[PDB]
């Protein structure tokens, strides 16, 4: 009679009828991804659109169950998410080109190009052309020909699609009683309904901005360290105290600064740890390297992979007869279902990333018994960071020395340790103040601070104050960065990269501390060890059913985000940094323009 | 790698909702619509109205711990009637003398 036993009984039914349909929509993505045919396009959206409208449809009926009346915690989590009607809420004009302007501006960033202006016959696509080219160049003006002139066509272009795009997703926020567009995306981190523990949504703004703050001193360090070897090139151009360029970065938007790991290796008397050379003798294939890695996962207590998953497994592209896709990703069907989709060759990285997807797998088995409206991270963030922690362990010498890849003759000292923090930094570190500054900038956008004629004026000013960069050109209002991005033009959330960071490194440490080990925490390895293992089983299975908060807590006994962890392990190289920097300026000043002089 | 195959076998369902707990060996075909609130149904599916029979999902794709498993369940019962089914013999050599 109580509405707590009409809610549960429509959850009862839901997770079976909603379990039906995402398995069938997510194998016909899996087999329009293997292999590409005209059967598999139309499969996947049609399967595609019976589960969307599957979800609008009970979208009407799970409105019907108000959660005041419900006492329970686990039936308004899964009522939380079918309560919001999607795009419904929307204007049947506003629903409809709100589809149409996401396409546009996915079909333009992939068919997007920049003719080469010294042959303006050939012309190249981003991915990979434009982004292989950027990585690998020295030059000045062959970095800026394809930095600059890619805006002019694209972020000059979407402008007006990227106006259209904001008005139209601000709307729907209005009408879910939120605040902004920027509040939606922090709606997955709001946490309410236990005593304690409940996480405000505007609390984000200032957790972002307060953990920020003690990352300066690090980043101030390394943000010199890279301007002092770059800056025998062109000292004209590059300041002590100034900015470096946007185009020097090392790719096109300065996401991971790995790319200049070549140049600033600072000792390049000693040799480097490369298990490319070792895989090559050993002789191994693409089957043995999922097996090593999930013996990885045996020895600390998780169990071990189905039939089924090793069996599915994709382990190649055989040519262009049938093609599929190399970006490495963990798909997760349903109902035991685990496959993976990669391009496996023999390289030092692909063992790191196999680690890495495997990751994603491992984690997803831990939670299968949840529920549909159950199965999931705690937030955006839980996702991949799971899967670095895996990588973390097996990049240490301690655990390439263990299966035979590492001779154990080799010498480890202080000059192969900091080389080893300075290539992990430049893809940590670096995106610290990167990612912390487009996302601020969008939120102060979608909430109507910034005017739209200031919306470059106040994106490269706040760049020299975050990142410390600097525009060789100046843009107009005309041109939008985040327009051409990846994840801005494909609306997938930006927040999770910051945030990842730092749990990843709460997990380092605390896994490490169960373990008993000893010394530095770059020489942890949690291999051999079940006594980590059963602390993280136990947070792995609840995925968002609890709060994210309280399962924080059950591991590294923290309430929130803590940059300690951050400090401590890239406390080596933070030692070794201030040093080397005496003899120049450590930190920069936004006053400074190479074309104002 | 029998009942399982491709496109999904929608011929075994099961009932998910009841209104109480079935008793030891009954065994309930009843088609009629679950009623989970006060209102009525009269048969036409709606709001607290639930068809109860489910379909089971079966493909060889799917992971080992959800693959289907035929159970055959055997009921021993010893009731007042004269006993007929034993166990097997065993039959030996005949020697003389």
Same mark, same amino acid.
């Given at each position: 009679?109580?509405?707590?036993?009409?809610?549960?009984?429509?959850?009862?039914?839901?997770?079976?009828?909603?379990?039906? #349909?995402?398995? $069938? /929509?997510? +194998? *016909?993505?899996?087999?329009?991804?293997?292999? !590409?045919?005209?059967?598999? %396009?139309?499969?996947?959206?049609?399967?595609?659109?019976?589960?969307?409208?599957? #979800?609008?449809? $009970? /979208?009407? +009926? *799970?409105?019907?169950?108000?959660?005041?009346? !419900?006492?329970?915690?686990? %039936?308004?989590?899964?009522?939380?998410?079918?309560?919001?009607?999607?795009?419904?809420?929307?204007?049947?004009?506003?629903?409809?080109?709100?589809?149409?302007?996401?396409?546009?501006?996915?079909?333009?960033?992939?068919?997007?190009?920049?003719?080469?202006?010294?042959?303006?016959?050939?012309?190249?696509?981003?991915?990979?052309?434009?982004?292989?080219?950027?990585?690998?160049?020295?030059?000045?003006?062959?970095?800026?020909?394809?930095?600059?002139?890619?805006?002019?066509?694209?972020?000059?272009?979407?402008?007006?699609?990227?106006?259209?795009?904001?008005?139209?997703?601000?709307?729907?926020?209005?009408?879910?009683?939120?605040?902004?567009?920027?509040?939606?995306?922090?709606?997955?981190?709001?946490?309410?309904?236990?005593?304690?523990?409940?996480?405000?949504?505007?609390?984000?703004?200032?957790?972002?901005?307060?953990?920020?703050?003690?990352?300066?001193?690090?980043?101030?360090?390394?943000?010199?360290?890279?301007?002092?070897?770059?800056?025998?090139?062109?000292?004209?151009?590059?300041?002590?105290?100034?900015?470096?360029?946007?185009?020097?970065?090392?790719?096109?938007?300065?996401?991971?600064?790995?790319?200049?790991?070549?140049?600033?290796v600072p000792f390049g008397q000693k040799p480097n740890?490369?298990?490319?050379?070792?895989?090559?003798?050993?002789?191994?294939?693409?089957?043995?390297?999922?097996?090593?890695?999930?013996?990885?996962?045996?020895?600390?207590?998780?169990?071990?992979?189905?039939?089924?998953?090793?069996?599915?497994?994709?382990?190649?592209?055989?040519?262009?007869?049938?093609?599929?896709?190399?970006?490495?990703?963990?798909?997760?069907?349903?109902?035991?279902?685990?496959?993976?989709?990669?391009?496996?060759?023999?390289?030092?990285?692909?063992?790191?990333?196999?680690?890495?997807?495997?990751?994603?797998?491992?984690?997803?088995?831990?939670?299968?018994?949840?529920?549909?409206?159950?199965?999931?991270?705690?937030?955006?963030?839980?996702?991949?960071?799971?899967?670095?922690?895996?990588?973390?362990?097996?990049?240490?010498?301690?655990?390439?020395?263990?299966?035979?890849?590492?001779?154990?003759?080799?010498?480890?000292?202080n000059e192969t340790?900091i080389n080893?923090?300075l290539?992990?930094?430049?893809?940590?570190?670096?995106?610290?103040?990167?990612?912390?500054?487009?996302?601020?900038?969008?939120?102060?956008?979608?909430?109507?601070?910034?005017?739209?004629?200031?919306?470059?004026?106040?994106?490269?000013?706040?760049?020299?104050?975050?990142?410390?960069?600097?525009?060789?050109?100046?843009?107009?209002?005309?041109?939008?960065?985040?327009?051409?991005?990846?994840?801005?033009?494909?609306?997938?959330?930006?927040?999770?990269?910051?945030?990842?960071?730092?749990?990843?490194?709460?997990?380092?440490?605390?896994?490490?501390?169960?373990?008993?080990?000893?010394?530095?925490?770059?020489?942890?390895?949690?291999?051999?060890?079940?006594?980590?293992?059963?602390?993280?089983?136990?947070?792995?299975?609840?995925?968002?059913?609890?709060?994210?908060?309280?399962?924080?807590?059950?591991?590294?006994?923290?309430?929130?985000?803590?940059?300690?962890?951050?400090?401590?392990?890239?406390?080596?190289?933070?030692?070794?940094?201030?040093?080397?920097?005496?003899?120049?300026?450590?930190?920069?000043?936004?006053?400074?323009?190479?074309?104002?002089? | 790698?029998?009942?399982?195959?491709?496109?999904?076998?929608?011929?075994?369902?099961?009932?998910?909702?009841?209104?109480?707990?079935?008793?030891?060996?009954?065994?309930?075909?009843?088609?009629?619509?679950?009623?989970?609130?006060?209102?009525?149904?009269?048969?036409?599916?709606?709001?607290?109205?639930?068809?109860?029979?489910?379909?089971?999902?079966?493909?060889?794709?799917?992971?080992?711990?959800?693959?289907?498993?035929?159970?055959?369940?055997?009921?021993?019962?010893?009731?007042?009637?004269?006993?007929?089914?034993?166990?097997?013999?065993?039959?030996?050599?005949?020697?003389?003398?």
């Amino acid at each position: 009679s109580t509405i707590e036993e009409q809610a549960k009984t429509f959850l009862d039914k839901f997770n079976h009828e909603a379990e039906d #349909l995402f398995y $069938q /929509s997510s +194998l *016909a993505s899996w087999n329009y991804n293997t292999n !590409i045919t005209e059967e598999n %396009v139309q499969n996947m959206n049609n399967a595609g659109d019976k589960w969307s409208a599957f #979800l609008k449809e $009970q /979208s009407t +009926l *799970a409105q019907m169950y108000p959660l005041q009346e !419900i006492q329970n915690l686990t %039936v308004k989590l899964q009522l939380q998410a079918l309560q919001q009607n999607g795009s419904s809420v929307l204007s049947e004009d506003k629903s409809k080109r709100l589809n149409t302007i996401l396409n546009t501006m996915s079909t333009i960033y992939s068919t997007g190009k920049v003719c080469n202006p010294d042959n303006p016959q050939e012309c190249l696509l981003l991915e990979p052309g434009l982004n292989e080219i950027m990585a690998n160049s020295l030059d000045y003006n062959e970095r800026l020909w394809a930095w600059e002139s890619w805006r002019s066509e694209v972020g000059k272009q979407l402008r007006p699609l990227y106006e259209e795009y904001v008005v139209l997703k601000n709307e729907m926020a209005r009408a879910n009683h939120y605040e902004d567009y920027g509040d939606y995306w922090r709606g997955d981190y709001e946490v309410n309904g236990v005593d304690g523990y409940d996480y405000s949504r505007g609390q984000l703004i200032e957790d972002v901005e307060h953990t920020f703050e003690e990352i300066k001193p690090l980043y101030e360090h390394l943000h010199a360290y890279v301007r002092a070897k770059l800056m025998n090139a062109y000292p004209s151009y590059i300041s002590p105290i100034g900015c470096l360029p946007a185009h020097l970065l090392g790719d096109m938007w300065g996401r991971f600064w790995t790319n200049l790991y070549s140049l600033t290796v600072p000792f390049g008397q000693k040799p480097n740890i490369d298990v490319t050379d070792a895989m090559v003798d050993q002789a191994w294939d693409a089957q043995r390297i999922f097996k090593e890695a999930e013996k990885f996962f045996v020895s600390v207590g998780l169990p071990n992979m189905t039939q089924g998953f090793w069996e599915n497994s994709m382990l190649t592209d055989p040519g262009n007869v049938q093609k599929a896709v190399c970006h490495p990703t963990a798909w997760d069907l349903g109902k035991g279902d685990f496959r993976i989709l990669m391009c496996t060759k023999v390289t030092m990285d692909d063992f790191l990333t196999a680690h890495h997807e495997m990751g994603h797998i491992q984690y997803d088995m831990a939670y299968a018994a949840q529920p549909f409206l159950l199965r999931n991270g705690a937030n955006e963030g839980f996702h991949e960071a799971v899967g670095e922690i895996m990588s973390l362990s097996a990049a240490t010498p301690k655990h390439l020395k263990s299966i035979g890849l590492l001779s154990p003759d080799f010498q480890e000292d202080n000059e192969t340790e900091i080389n080893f923090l300075l290539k992990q930094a430049l893809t940590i570190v670096g995106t610290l103040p990167f990612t912390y500054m487009l996302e601020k900038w969008r939120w102060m956008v979608f909430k109507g601070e910034i005017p739209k004629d200031q919306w470059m004026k106040k994106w490269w000013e706040m760049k020299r104050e975050i990142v410390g960069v600097v525009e060789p050109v100046p843009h107009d209002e005309t041109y939008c960065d985040p327009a051409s991005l990846f994840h801005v033009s494909n609306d997938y959330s930006f927040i999770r990269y910051y945030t990842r960071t730092l749990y990843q490194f709460q997990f380092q440490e605390a896994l490490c501390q169960a373990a008993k080990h000893e010394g530095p925490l770059h020489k942890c390895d949690i291999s051999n060890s079940t006594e980590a293992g059963q602390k993280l089983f136990n947070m792995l299975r609840l995925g968002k059913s609890e709060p994210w908060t309280l399962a924080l807590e059950n591991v590294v006994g923290a309430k929130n985000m803590n940059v300690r962890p951050l400090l401590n392990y890239f406390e080596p190289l933070f030692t070794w940094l201030k040093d080397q920097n005496k003899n120049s300026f450590v930190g920069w000043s936004t006053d400074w323009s190479p074309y104002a002089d | 790698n029998l009942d399982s195959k491709v496109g999904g076998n929608y011929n075994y369902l099961y009932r998910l909702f009841r209104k109480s707990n079935l008793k030891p060996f009954e065994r309930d075909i009843s088609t009629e619509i679950y009623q989970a609130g006060s209102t009525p149904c009269n048969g036409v599916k709606g709001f607290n109205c639930y068809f109860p029979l489910q379909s089971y999902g079966f493909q060889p794709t799917y992971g080992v711990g959800y693959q289907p498993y035929r159970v055959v369940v055997l009921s021993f019962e010893l009731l007042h009637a004269p006993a007929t089914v034993c166990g097997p013999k065993k039959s030996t050599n005949l020697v003389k003398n």
